[PDB]
Amino acid sequence: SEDECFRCGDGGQLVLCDRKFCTKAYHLSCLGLGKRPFGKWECPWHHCDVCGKPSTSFCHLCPNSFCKEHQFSCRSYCSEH
């Protein structure tokens, strides 16, 4: 479990991803949630930043990722870095 939000980089009160082997953690506000998830929750690294479909290409520095239809510099990283 990472100790800093994968979206914003800072620490504090973080929620953890339930996908198998995902160590990524997030603030609620950085995800657009007001309360902790109420069942199995998968974090945004796993789904396309455009359409929400399962992602195939992944930023290693933040949860931006894209599916085949919508997919970066070089580990690969997106614009924010």
Distance CA 30, CA 79 (A): 18
59 binds Zn ion (CB under 5 A): yes
Interface with Na ion, residue 65, by CB under 5 A: yes
**What is the DSSP annotation of 13-71?**
S-EE--STT---EE-HHHHT-SS--SS----GGGB-TTT-SBPSEE-SSSS-EE-GGG-
Residue 65 contact partner, candidates Na ion, Zn ion, none, CB within 5 to 8 A by sort of partner: Na ion
51 interacts with, out of Na ion, Zn ion, none, CB within 5 to 8 A per kind: Zn ion
Contact flag: residue 15 with Zn ion (CB under 5 A): no
Q: Whose CB is nearest to Na ion?
A: 65
Give contact residues for Na ion (rule: CB under 5 A).
44, 49, 63, 65
